[PDB]
From a paper:
Caudovirales, the taxonomic order for the tailed double-stranded DNA bacteriophages, is characterized by the presence of a tail—a host cell attachment organelle that is connected to the genome-containing spherical or elongated capsid via a neck. We describe cryo-EM structures of the neck, the neck-capsid and neck-tail junctions, and capsid of the [name]. The tail to capsid junction involves a symmetry mismatch that is bridged by the neck, and is therefore crucial for the assembly of tailed phage. The extensive network of disulfide bonds within and between neck, collar, capsid and tail provides an exceptional structural stability to Milano.
A 3-fold symmetrized map focused at the neck-tail junction was used to understand the interactions between the collar and the tail. Namely, the head-proximal end of the collar interacts with the β-sandwich domain of neck 1 (gp14), while the tail-proximal end of the collar interacts with the tail sheath (gp20). The interaction of the C15-symmetric collar with the C6-symmetric tail sheath is more complex. Five collar subunits (e.g., n, n + 1, n + 2, n + 3, n + 4) comprising the asymmetric unit interact with four tail sheath subunits belonging to the two topmost sheath rings (or layers) that we named Fn, Fn+1, Sn, Sn+1, where F and S denote first and second ring, respectively. The collar subunits n (Cys19), n + 3 (Cys19), and n + 4 (Cys23) form disulfide bonds with tail sheath subunits Sn (Cys467), Sn+1 (Cys467) and Fn+1 (Cys244), respectively, thus linking the collar to the tail sheath by nine (three in each of the three asymmetric units) disulfide bonds. Additionally, the Milano collar connects the sheath to the diaphragm-like structure formed by the neck 1 lumen protrusion loop, allowing for the sheath contraction signal to reach to the genome directly, instead of indirectly through the neck proteins, in preparation for genome release during the attachment to the host cell.
Residue numbers in the entry:
A (entry chain Ae), B (entry chain Ad), C (entry chain Aa), D (entry chain AV): 3 to 130
E (entry chain G): 1 to 230
F (entry chain F): 1 to 12, 18 to 230
G (entry chain p): 4 to 89, 201 to 347, 363 to 498
H (entry chain s): 379 to 498
I (entry chain q): 442 to 498
J (entry chain q): 253 to 348, 360 to 378
Write the structure that this text describes.
Amino acid sequence: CNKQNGVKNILITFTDCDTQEVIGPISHEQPDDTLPTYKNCAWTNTALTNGYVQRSASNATMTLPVVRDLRVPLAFYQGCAQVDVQVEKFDGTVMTLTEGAVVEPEESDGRSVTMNIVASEIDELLPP
Amino acid sequence: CNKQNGVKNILITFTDCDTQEVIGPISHEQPDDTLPTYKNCAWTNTALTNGYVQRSASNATMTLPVVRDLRVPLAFYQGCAQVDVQVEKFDGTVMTLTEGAVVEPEESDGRSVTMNIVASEIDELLPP
Amino acid sequence: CNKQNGVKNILITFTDCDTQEVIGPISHEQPDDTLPTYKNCAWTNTALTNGYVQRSASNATMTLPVVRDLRVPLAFYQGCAQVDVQVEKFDGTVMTLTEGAVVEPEESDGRSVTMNIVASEIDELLPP
Amino acid sequence: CNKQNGVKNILITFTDCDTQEVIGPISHEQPDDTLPTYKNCAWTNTALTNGYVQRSASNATMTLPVVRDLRVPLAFYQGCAQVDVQVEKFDGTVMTLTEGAVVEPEESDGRSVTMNIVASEIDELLPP
Amino acid sequence: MYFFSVDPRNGASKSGDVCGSCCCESISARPGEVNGVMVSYAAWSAPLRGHGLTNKTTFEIDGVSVTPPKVSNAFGRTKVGVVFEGTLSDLFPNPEGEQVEYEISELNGPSNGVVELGANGAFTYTPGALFTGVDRFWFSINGNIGEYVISVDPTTSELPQPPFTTPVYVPAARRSVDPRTHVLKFVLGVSPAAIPGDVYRLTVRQVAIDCDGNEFVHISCYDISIGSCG
Amino acid sequence: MYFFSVDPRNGAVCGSCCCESISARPGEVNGVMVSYAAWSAPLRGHGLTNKTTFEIDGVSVTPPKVSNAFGRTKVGVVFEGTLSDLFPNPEGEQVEYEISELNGPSNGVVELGANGAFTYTPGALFTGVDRFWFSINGNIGEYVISVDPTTSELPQPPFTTPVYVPAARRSVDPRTHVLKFVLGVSPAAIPGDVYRLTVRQVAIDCDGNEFVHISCYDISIGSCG
Amino acid sequence: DALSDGFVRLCIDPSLNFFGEGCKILVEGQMTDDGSATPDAVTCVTSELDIIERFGQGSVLTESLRKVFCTCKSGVSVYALPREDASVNPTPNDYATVVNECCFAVYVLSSDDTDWQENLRDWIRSAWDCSKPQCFGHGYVFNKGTLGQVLADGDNSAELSRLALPTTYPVLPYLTNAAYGALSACSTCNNPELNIQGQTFGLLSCINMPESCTPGWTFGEVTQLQANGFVVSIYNDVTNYLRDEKNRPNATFRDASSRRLAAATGVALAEFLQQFNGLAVFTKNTNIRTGIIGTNPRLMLGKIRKWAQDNVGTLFSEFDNINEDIQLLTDFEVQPKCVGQPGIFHLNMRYRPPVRGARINVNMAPALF
Amino acid sequence: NATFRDASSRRLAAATGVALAEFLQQFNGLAVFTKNTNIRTGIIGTNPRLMLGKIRKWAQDNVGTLFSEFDNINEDIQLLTDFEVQPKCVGQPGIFHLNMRYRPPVRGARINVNMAPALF
Amino acid sequence: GTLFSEFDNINEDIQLLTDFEVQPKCVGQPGIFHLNMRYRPPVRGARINVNMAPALF
Amino acid sequence: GYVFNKGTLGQVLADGDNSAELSRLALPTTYPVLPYLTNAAYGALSACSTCNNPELNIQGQTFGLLSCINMPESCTPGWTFGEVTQLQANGFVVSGSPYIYNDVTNYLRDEKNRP
C-alpha cells in the first residue's frame, strides 16, 4: 500500500568477467532495517565563488546491504564479478542498474555484505 | 502564533537545464524535526592578526531536507536540475532563492533527501 | 449532564497490502474497562527557552485494545494489514481513522490484542 | 460464545544441533494460569513522521512457559537444541512452529522454564 | 407517498438554502401513477396558536416544459347497448405513414367495456351491458400515446362533455386537513400521456385561522418532473 | 421463490432504466412475491385489491426456428401425425427428431416413427386438450392436440407464449401488503432471450378511491440454472 | 530469424493505437446529402478517411469536424450527429431518443438559431439533474450579432459557453466555435482543474485569421461581454451565469473549471459511496453486534466527513464550517415517524471551487533618486 | 506519414525488431509472479514492474544506436499483463502485451543557404 | 514458490480426511489418514507478443 | 513417457487422446528422418537434463536442440504455420540439428471440463 517506506524485492545477476558464466537473477533479503541508498545524477557539483558551480563528470553510485546467498560464492560480492542489480520499494518505485562493478570492498563475516556499486546510469520508474 | 519556531511552507520549482522544461512550484514536507539552515552574506571573513580580517567573496548557502515527491524523479534532487526554492516559517519570515544549484550531492534512500543549495543571494522578508 | 464515559461501537476494516483483499468493516468488543486513547494534533511541540517552542511535524496516534475475532487471522492485528478503524463513545463522539498502520506490535496471547495505530489525521464529530 | 480462553495441548520436538538426533514430539503442561504469547507478522513497523511508516524485516517470536520434562536435559530448553513447538487452545485455534531457536536464555530453577522461541514464520489454523 | 415540511416563515430558513434553493420542492412522477402527498404546516401554524388549518386550499397547475404531444386526442359518443365503431388514423398528423402500429396497451385499457382493434386504425368498442357513463382507453400510435373517450348515455340524449384529463392533475375532491396535527393530504394523479422529461409547477395556497376567525395565507410551490421508469 | 420490495415513491437498482431482474430456466414454473408494504402502509387504508394487471414484452426474442401445430381428434380414436413439414431445415441437415420424456403428453402416449411420424393414442374416457414438446435437431417446438367428446368439436386454445403468468393464480394479502403470483416459462424459450414484465397494482383508501403503482422486471431466460 | 520459435510475436504497424479513448465530444450540424450515412444517428467517426461521404461534403459539419479533427491530435473520441436539412435554418430537434444514456462530455452546435441552442441547453440540464444516473455533460455554442443583440440573445444557462462574435469577424463563426470546444476537451478531459485562457493554454491553432488594427468589440464592449457572460476571444473561459435562483451574485458557477471539477467530485463521490452497499445499517438501537459487518448513520456521516477532508484543496477548497457544510439526515430523523422507512438517507454538501488567480492591479509610480 | 519513407528507416526497423526479440528471449520460462509480487528468498523470477524496468533500461541504453532520444518514456513503453487487456475470465496465465514506439534517429539534409554578396 | 504456486485458499485444498472414528478398540490396525492436495504448477513465461509502433518527430 | 506419431495432420491430430502420461512428438508425412531416432533423442535429452533439476523447460533452441540428428538442411518445413498453430492447441511436441519447442504432453481436458 501507499505510505510504506521499505524494500520489497532485490534481484541480483552475477556474471563472471573470467569465464563469461551467468548466474541469476537471484532474489536477496535485507539483513537489517537499513535501506539501499541511491544517487542518480551522474554529474557532481563543486561550489565556486559568487553563485557559480563547476559541473564535472561523475558516476552513478549505489549502496546495497544484502544477506549472502549460500549458493553464490562470497567472491562475487567482494568485487570479482559484474553485477546487475534491480530493486523495488513498497510504494512502487523500481530502480535498475546494469553491468555495475563493486568498488572498494569491505571486510565481511560471511552472512551480510555491503556492496558499493558504481555504474554509468540508474533508471527510475516513478509509480503511476 | 507569534512564538512557535519551525517551517510552515516549502515551495520548489525544478528546471532541467538541457531540455529547458520547468516543473512546479510544488510544495513539500519536512522529513524530521530538524529545520533548514541558511547563510545570506556572500562575503565570508577570515581572521587575520591584530584585529584585522580578510573579506573574500563567496556564496549564499542553504541546507534543506525534504521528502521526495513521488512525481519528480530523484535525479532532480541529486543535482541534475536547477532549483528555485522558497521557505516560509511560522513567525512570518520568508526566504526565497532563485537559480540554485545542488552542490555536493549526498547519498539518499529515495524518500528523504538533504539538498545543499548554493546561490548568488538569498532574500528575506523580515516579518512586518 | 455529560453522559457516562465509555465506548459503544468499534468498527475495524482490514486490508492486506499483498493480495489487495479487503475484510470488513467488522465490529469488535472491548476486552476490559480500559478505553482507546487518542491524539489528534499532528504537530508535537518541544520546550525551548523563555516561552518559545519548536513546532515540528508528527503523526496522529491511537491506542486500541480489542478481543480478536476468531475469523480474522491474528497476523492482521500485529501489523500485516492496513486498518480502517472507527470508534463511537456513549456521549455521541465518533472518531474515524483511515488507512492507518499498526506500529510497534506487542506480544499477544490470542484473544486480546492492543494495537498502536499511527495515521496522518483523525477526525472528530463533536456530538450536537 | 467464545469458549474459555486457555491452552489444551503443547507439543515440543527437540533436535540437537550437533548430532542431529531428534526427540519427540513430547507433550508438556502449563506451570501456571498464564498463556503463551505470539507475534506472527514478520515485518515490524516504525513511526515515521506525517503518518508514514518504515516497513523493515523482522522475526516472528513466541514466548512459552512449560514444566521441564524429567527425561529431557535442561540444556535442551536453555538454547542448546533446535525446537519445533505446537500449541492448541480450547476454542480450536492451533499455532505451529518449525525450526525454532531458543534465544536469550533466562535462568531457571529446573522445573519451570520460559522459552523465547524465534522462528521464520508461525502458522495458524483459525478454528473451523 | 410524499411528505413535505413547510417553511416556518420565521427568521432563518431551512432545507439547503445554504446556497439558496431551487425554490420549489421536487416531485418525481411516472406516467400513469396516482400517488399521495402530505404537507405538514406544524412548523408554521403551531406557533400561530389558534384553530389550525381550514378546508380552503386552492391549487394551480402550470407547465414550464411541456413538449406538446404528437398524437391528438378524440371524443366519441354512442347510446346504451349499441356497439360503437371508430377510427384511429386521423388522430396522427404525420410527415410519413411509415409503419404506423396502432396499439392498445392493456394496462390502461377500458373500464366498463371491451375493445377489438382492427387491422388498420379501426376499433370496435362494445360497452358493458346495463351500463351508462364515461369510459376511456389509451391508445399508442407509433409510440405516441393518446386517449379516446367514448362516454355512453343511457339513450336519453347525451352526456355533455368529459374534460379531457390533462397530463398532470389533482382530483377535484380527495383532499383533507387535520386541524389537530396540522397536516394537509391531497392526491396527485398523472395521466399516462405525460412525456418523460416534462416539468410542471404546482402551487398551493393554504389558509389557516386564528382563534377569532381571521385568516393567515401561505403559498408554496412544487416542481413535478415526469420521468419514465420512476 | 423470488421476493422483491417496491420503492415507496419518495424520490429517495436502476439497472438500465428502472426495471428489476429475474433469472429463469426453460420449463420451470416458479413463484414471486412482491411486498407493497413499503408503499401502501403510510397510506393508511384498506390495503391492496385484487386488480393487478400483467403485460409481457420481449426486448430479445431470437425468432423461433421450428413452428407449432394444432390437432382436433376425437375421443378414444387414435390420431396420426407428421413432424417433417414443421422444421424448414434451410441448409441440408439431418432431420433427427426427438420427444423429450420430461415434457411428454399428459393423458396419452406418442409413438415416434422412423421419419417424423407419430401416433397419439389419447387416454380412454378423456375429452379435452393435451400438449407435448418435440426437439427437431436441438430446436424445441410444441404440438397441441384437442380430443373432442364425439359430439361436434372443441374450441382452439392459444399456443402458450415462451414466458407467461398464469390466468388465475395471483393473490393479495391486505394484512401484510404482499402480492403473490406465478412465473411460467415455456420449454421452447431460447436461452439468452430477455423479456419484460410490467405490473400495475392498485391500492385503496378508506373511502374507496384508488392509488396506482407501476413497475417492471426483466426476465432473463438462461440455460443451466 | 531468431523469431521462428514462437515466443515473441511482433507486429510492426505504423498506425497503431494504445490510448484509452474517453473524451467523447459530440458535433451537431446540418448536412448535404452527398454524405452516404443515415441522418439523425450518432456516428462515432474515425479519423479523416471516412469523411465527406459520411456527413456531407461542403456543408457546415464538414468544416466544423475538420477543425475539430484538427486541433486535438489525440485524446478524444469524436462523435457526430448529422442532422438533415429541409430565415430557413431547419433546426427542429427534440431528439433525446437518437442521443440517449450514452453520454458525451463536450457538445458543439454549429447553428446560430436560438431554438436549437435552447433545446441543447435543456437536454444538457436534464442530464445534469438530480436524477441518479449522471454523466455531467457540457456544451459550446456561438452567437454573432451586435452588442445589443448579443446581450439580448442570451440566457442564464450555465451549461453552455455561448461565444460572442462581432458583425465584422472574418472567419465564419461556427468554425472557431468547434475549435474552441475541441481544444478544451482534449486538454481538460483528464485534468479538470485546467482553465482554457491566456495565450499558451487556449490559443486556437486552426484559425489563421487575417490581422488588422480595428479588432472588434472595443474595450467597453469587451467588459460588457465578459461581465455579462460570453467568452469573447481566447480569454475569460467562463460560462454565462450572471445570476441564480433569486440572488444574482453566485460566483461559484462562473468558471468552466469550476463546472468540470464539480462533475469530477460528483463522479468521485458516486463511485466512492458504493462501498456502503450491503453493509447493513442499524438505525434503532445504534449498537452493531459483535461479529456482524454493519454501520450506524453517525458512523456513515463520520466516514463521509473523513472523505471530504482528504480531497480538500484538490477538489473542494477549505470547507469553512465542516460541522454544517456536510449533513447526513436519515429518513426517520426528518420525517416524524409515520412515513419513515429504513434505507433512505439524505446527504447534502457545499461545493466551493478552489480559488484561482485573477487580475493583479499594478500601480507603479516612478520617481528620481 | 513519411515514417516509412526512408528505406533505411524500414531496414533499421527490422533490425531493432529482431534485436528487441533477442533481448526478450531471456524472459523465457523463468517464473513470473503476478499475484503477490513478493519473490521469496532464493527463487528466480520477476513480475510485471520488474520487467518493465529492464525494458526501459534496454531502451535507454540503445538510444543513439537504433532509437533516438525518446519522448515521455512513461508513455511509449507499456507492459500490460494478459488478464488486463482481455475479456475478464479468459487470459491465460503467463502472457504479456508489451508495445513501444521507435522514433528513428535524425540525419542531415535541407541546407538552404541565403548568401549575400553585399558590398562595403 | 518452488514446488508449486500460491494456494488460492489453503484451507480448502489441503484436507486430511481420516477414518479413525470407524476403527473400534476391538482391533489395533491404524493408518488410514489419506491426504488429498490440489496442484497448480508455478506459472512460467510464454508468448510475450509485442506491438511496435514506429513514428517520427 | 515419450513416443512419436507420424503422418498427415488429420491422422496425427486424431491419433491422440487426453493421455497425460505421454509426450507425442508429431512428425510430418514427409519427415526425412527415421522417427525412432528423433523420438529416442528427445526422450534421452529430457532425461539426462532433468535428473537433478526437474523444473527446466526443455524447449526452444538453446536447451532442447537435439544434438545428434544432423538433419539435411532444406528450405521447406513439414507442418506449416497453420497446421502447427493447430496442433499446439491440441497437445503435441512439434519439432522444427532440429530443435524442440512447446514441450507439452497430450493433456487437454480433465474429466469433462475441457479447459
